[PDB]
Design an enzyme around this catalytic site. Structure first.
Site, short mmCIF file in Angstrom:
data_model
loop_
_atom_site.label_atom_id
_atom_site.label_comp_id
_atom_site.label_asym_id
_atom_site.label_seq_id
_atom_site.Cartn_x
_atom_site.Cartn_y
_atom_site.Cartn_z
N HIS A 149 0.81 -1.21 0.00
CA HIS A 149 0.00 0.00 0.00
C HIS A 149 0.84 1.27 0.00
O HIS A 149 0.30 2.36 -0.17
CB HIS A 149 -0.94 0.01 1.20
CG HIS A 149 -2.09 0.95 1.07
ND1 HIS A 149 -2.92 1.27 2.12
CD2 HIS A 149 -2.56 1.63 -0.01
CE1 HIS A 149 -3.85 2.12 1.70
NE2 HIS A 149 -3.65 2.35 0.42
N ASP A 154 -2.39 2.12 -4.06
CA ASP A 154 -3.58 2.32 -3.25
C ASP A 154 -4.55 1.15 -3.44
O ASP A 154 -4.34 0.25 -4.26
CB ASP A 154 -4.23 3.66 -3.58
CG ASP A 154 -4.83 3.71 -4.98
OD1 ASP A 154 -4.64 2.75 -5.76
OD2 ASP A 154 -5.50 4.71 -5.29
#
Lengths: 230, 230, 219
Positions: C190, C194
């Site tokens: 992450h 995203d």
């Protein structure tokens, strides 16, 4: 880009096919055949035939017999057209197409007018064995009066084949497939074979060819008609 | 009654068609094709395709891909004969029949062996846009090795196309129509398409043409076969 | 060393997992239909890995960042698509690198998998053979995992987790039917990727899988 000089033998073959194209009025007619009766008869008695005569019961013999009978009914088609003359053949000398390691080779079966189904299969197996051994004499390919071709083993629905010169007509066989077909006014699944007849129009009109092929169709729809000679 | 002297352009066209007849052993084989799966996937995914590439998913691209695969399996058919030889083409070039302010004109699509469906549609649209604008350079019709024709846009059941020289084969497309057909041994209403394949017999025997067309039909009956290069 | 490297991978990348379901019916149907033909044509069986490799390569062409790898202070995008595949061996799981998968076809992928598996069992795999990958496809379903959270192979940023197919209730045209389903896992970093990129990537993968014609249409 990449070039290959053509073998003089195969160039000769191509030139002979071109000569057959130019010399003869090439055209084709067609008829459809429900092979069901002969298929059932073969499926029933193939074991008996193979055990009795030491050779399986293919399909070729039936077409050979039908062609011989129909040619006896049609004195002109068996004859060959030459420089200025019709060579009416008293004898039926059919030609058969078989695959070869060298492509396609066409032997000649002689006096098929008297051969029985078992004898036809014996001759076919003998010449096929010769072809596999490549022990086929050149004279085995001469003396023909008519030719039957088998494009259906490779799966053609139908198509136009080319007559072997100097013969005036040939039959073109095609792959049997289950198609809808009207039987006694009902649409049913039927094994149907498409038949093509390429012939010379210079000496054979439409009527003779269509009667010839329709008669073959009628004969093959009921193999008993050979037994009755009708 | 009235006389009209023909244009020398059409005189050239007729003369070269006659040369095609005199040079190549023109003959045709045929096949049937249940286009159902392909039109089903086309109807389902055409919106996505046209939104993805800006071009509507027609039918030509499938035939182009099938022909490229089958010609990759048939090096001889992609090739051509030049008065003593066979020039095997390392590349795949297809002429396509498209209407114009004059009508049927054949641009050449080059290196279709690598061209993908969306890009096939893009190429077809670009050349046919040149077709409407009459901004087609003459060399755009030069370089083909095979031809895919579409008689079905006007509604032929099946006919006999003429190969574009110096090629040795041509495919003739025909109108899709709902016909009785056998599926799992039952008569059903099936949209079927007739395929004709005219070719030169001097170099291509019947077996090569029938295997070519049967393989094409099998390929088109299941796009998953393209997906698996089978 | 392996344990410490896995711990370093845990500490470096922001590992987290998303999931999707997959009606695998169409692909196994076409495989069951054409496996004999494919194996006779190319001399190699038709497994399951190749389709997933093709889908991953396509969707990674759609997702350049996922192909890319995160390093000391930069993102190293890749013009090439290299995928590690987990295969058991006499020394356990080993990950060979499949290179230039963007051009490999199903038969070629199967040939590569077969030759590398043969090398793996015979232990004739060079260490360099397991170097060069930019993504990894793990297959825990060979043993029967329902679904899990596989650990990414550094320096890569994402991994696929295969799981065992089983017949489950599923909805088709608003009807509850028995459908063979595989559950999918996607562990990713992450720090640079995203949630939206990962979910779009995996959803596109899924769409590609349930309709193999979509590869034919590059949709």
């Amino acid at each position: 880009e990449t070039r290959v000089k053509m073998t003089r033998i195969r160039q000769r073959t191509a030139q002979r096919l071109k000569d057959s194209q130019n010399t003869a009025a090439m055209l084709t007619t067609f008829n459809e055949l429900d092979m069901s009766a002969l298929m059932n008869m073969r499926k029933t008695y193939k074991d008996e035939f193979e055990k009795k005569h030491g050779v399986k019961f293919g399909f070729m013999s039936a077409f050979v017999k039908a062609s011989t009978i129909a040619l006896k009914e049609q004195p002109i088609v068996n004859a060959s057209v030459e420089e200025n003359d019709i060579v009416y053949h008293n004898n039926v000398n059919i030609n058969v197409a078989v695959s070869a390691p060298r492509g396609l080779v066409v032997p000649v079966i002689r006096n098929c007018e008297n051969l029985s189904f078992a004898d036809i299969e014996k001759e076919i197996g003998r010449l096929s064995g010769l072809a596999r051994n490549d022990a086929l004499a050149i004279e085995d390919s001469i003396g023909g009066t008519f030719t039957i071709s088998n494009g259906g083993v490779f799966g053609s629905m139908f198509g136009t084949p080319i007559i072997n010169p100097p013969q005036s007509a040939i039959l073109g066989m095609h792959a049997i497939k289950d198609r809808p077909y009207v039987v006694n006014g009902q649409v049913v699944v039927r094994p149907i074979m498409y038949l093509a007849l390429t012939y010379d129009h210079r000496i054979i009109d439409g009527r003779e060819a269509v009667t010839f092929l329709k008669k073959i169709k009628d004969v093959l729809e009921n193999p008993e008609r050979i037994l009755l000679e009708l």
